[PDB]
């Protein structure tokens, strides 16, 4: 509608997250330069795409001539969103 | 890196690959091959040059 | 009812067995004229296939006829007998003695 | 209209801007004679054309027999104007 066009003029910010993990503060203090930290996500899984910190879609990492890119694959339809938030 | 400016100079703009344009060109090549064979009564050979 | 080279190039873009079947169904003189214009490999393949022709199904014959009809072009009033060589000789005979000297020259040259 | 003709008799001033940049005052003080200062705009980009300090169109630099000239290329239609002002 016309208000969709009005908010179209408003820029927004997109965020791509590689993964997430949980650990104690003591473990973080144990970490030093060159330390290795694992993530919950596996290899080849689509990465989360966030708009102002809200996940809306998923994509795959590509490189464009010198720049990283995300190839959108799937959405976060309410059933899947509720399932992943329940975790 | 620092160079003097010349108003009579211009640069290029990376690469702008158009796969859909190439597909359209190939389809047009097929159609035009058929049309030229129909018209000139001889079989032509049409090769699509690089965009 | 068509020119040998046009029909040859038309059926050249087909499977060799189809070419052999069409040539068998065509007139002997027309088929011989068409085959003389084909390449050695295609000509040999067609001659081998004709020597082992066992008949075609009626449905395949009908489909081949329909395809050939579809491939047809504006063949109405194909070709035309106007002149050439003989007309050139008549024109040369009507051109001056000096002009026919030039004619001997150029014709020997070609 | 007739008032367009009336204001036609009124001359106006046109301004062509090569580019813009931002820096601190300390950096400006560090600058001396012969110093090199970069601009946000790139090479070959159309230059801004300003009427009394208001951007209305863009053009390209040409030289006329001894004098610089601007070859107008595009306009600053409200969508693009809002987009570039948001920057």
């Amino acid at each position: 509608m016309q208000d969709i066009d009005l908010i179209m003029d408003i820029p927004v910010k997109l965020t791509v997250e590689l993964g997430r993990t949980r650990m104690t503060i003591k473990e973080l203090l144990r970490l030093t330069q060159g330390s290795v930290v694992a993530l919950d996500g596996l290899a080849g899984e689509p990465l989360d795409i966030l708009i102002n910190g809200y996940l809306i879609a998923q994509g795959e990492v590509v490189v464009v001539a010198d720049k990283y890119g995300v190839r959108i694959t799937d959405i976060i339809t309410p059933s899947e969103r509720m399932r992943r938030l329940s975790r | 890196d620092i160079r003097p400016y010349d108003p009579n100079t211009q640069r290029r703009v990376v690469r702008e690959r158009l796969q859909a344009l190439e597909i359209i060109n190939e389809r047009f090549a097929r159609q035009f091959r058929m049309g030229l064979f129909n018209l000139l009564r001889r079989s032509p050979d049409i090769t699509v040059g690089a965009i | 009812f068509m020119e040998p080279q046009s029909a040859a190039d038309l059926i050249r873009d087909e499977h060799p067995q189809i070419i052999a079947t069409i040539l068998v169904h065509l007139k002997r003189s027309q088929a011989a004229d068409i085959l003389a214009l084909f390449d050695e490999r295609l000509r040999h393949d067609v001659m081998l296939r004709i020597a082992t022709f066992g008949g075609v199904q009626p449905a395949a014959l009908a489909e081949l006829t329909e395809v050939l009809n579809g491939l047809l072009d504006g063949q109405n009033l194909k070709r035309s007998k106007m002149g050439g060589v003989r007309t050139a000789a008549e024109i040369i005979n009507l051109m001056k003695t000096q002009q026919e000297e030039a004619v001997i020259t150029a014709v020997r040259e070609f």
Side-chain angles (χ1 to χ4, degrees), chain A, chain B, chain C:
Chain A
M1 57 187 181
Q2 298 176 6
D3 296 358
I4 294 185
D5 298 2
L6 293 186
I7 64 180
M8 271 157 43
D9 312 331
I10 309 178
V12 301
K13 184 178 181 179
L14 187 145
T15 301
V16 177
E17 294 183 349
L18 176 61
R20 56 185 60 88
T21 182
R22 295 186 177 183
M23 63 172 57
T24 77
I25 292 190
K26 185 180 187 180
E27 296 177 13
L28 179 59
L29 297 183
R30 291 180 179 179
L31 297 174
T32 57
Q33 180 177 359
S35 299
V36 175
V37 174
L39 296 181
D40 298 332
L42 307 184
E45 295 182 348
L47 299 195
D48 299 0
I49 306 177
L50 285 76
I51 298 293
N52 303 327
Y54 189 93
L55 168 65
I56 89 288
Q58 292 182 358
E60 295 177 357
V61 185
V62 298
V63 180
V64 188
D66 253 330
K67 303 182 180 181
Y68 293 156
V70 42
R71 183 183 302 269
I72 305 178
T73 54
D74 200 69
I75 336 181
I76 315 296
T77 56
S79 303
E80 177 62 30
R81 177 173 299 168
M82 236 64 64
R83 172 189 171 184
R84 68 187 302 102
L85 288 181
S86 304
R87 308 173 188 175
Chain B
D1 289 3
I2 302 177
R3 308 174 182 178
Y5 170 71
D6 187 10
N8 308 329
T9 53
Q10 191 164 323
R11 301 300 181 181
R12 295 97 270 181
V13 273
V14 282
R15 186 175 287 269
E16 304 301 329
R17 323 183 63 179
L18 305 179
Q19 304 180 12
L21 181 62
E22 186 176 1
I23 297 179
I24 292 178
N25 292 327
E26 298 294 335
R27 192 178 299 100
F28 157 75
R30 178 97 73 261
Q31 304 290 346
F32 200 51
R33 176 214 64 180
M34 281 301 303
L36 291 184
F37 171 70
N38 181 26
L39 177 61
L40 297 184
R41 310 300 187 272
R42 296 183 179 181
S43 300
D45 188 8
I46 300 183
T47 302
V48 177
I51 300 181
Chain C
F1 253 155
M2 292 182 56
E3 191 267 343
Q5 172 68 16
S6 302
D9 195 11
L10 177 60
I11 66 179
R12 195 177 310 172
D13 321 355
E14 288 292 337
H15 187 271
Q17 181 68 19
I18 305 179
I19 306 173
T21 304
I22 294 178
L23 290 173
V24 168
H25 287 64
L26 288 175
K27 292 177 182 178
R28 293 150 300 277
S29 61
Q30 191 73 13
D33 298 359
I34 288 175
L35 275 177
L37 306 168
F38 281 159
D39 61 82
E40 181 178 356
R41 183 182 185 181
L42 177 61
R43 195 176 309 177
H44 291 4
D45 191 10
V46 169
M47 294 313 300
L48 291 177
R49 290 178 180 271
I50 295 183
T52 59
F53 187 82
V56 67
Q57 303 178 2
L61 172 67
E63 291 200 6
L64 170 59
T65 305
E66 183 178 1
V67 169
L68 292 182
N69 292 313
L71 294 178
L72 293 182
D73 298 326
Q75 310 297 149
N76 181 25
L77 298 181
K78 187 175 184 57
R79 305 179 68 260
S80 59
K81 299 298 181 179
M82 267 58 180
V85 187
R86 180 180 179 180
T87 306
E90 297 172 4
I91 295 181
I92 290 173
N93 297 326
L94 295 184
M95 294 177 64
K96 300 179 184 179
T97 65
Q98 316 190 1
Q99 292 177 0
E100 176 186 358
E101 301 159 5
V103 156
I104 295 171
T105 318
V107 299
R108 298 311 190 299
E109 290 173 358
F110 200 57

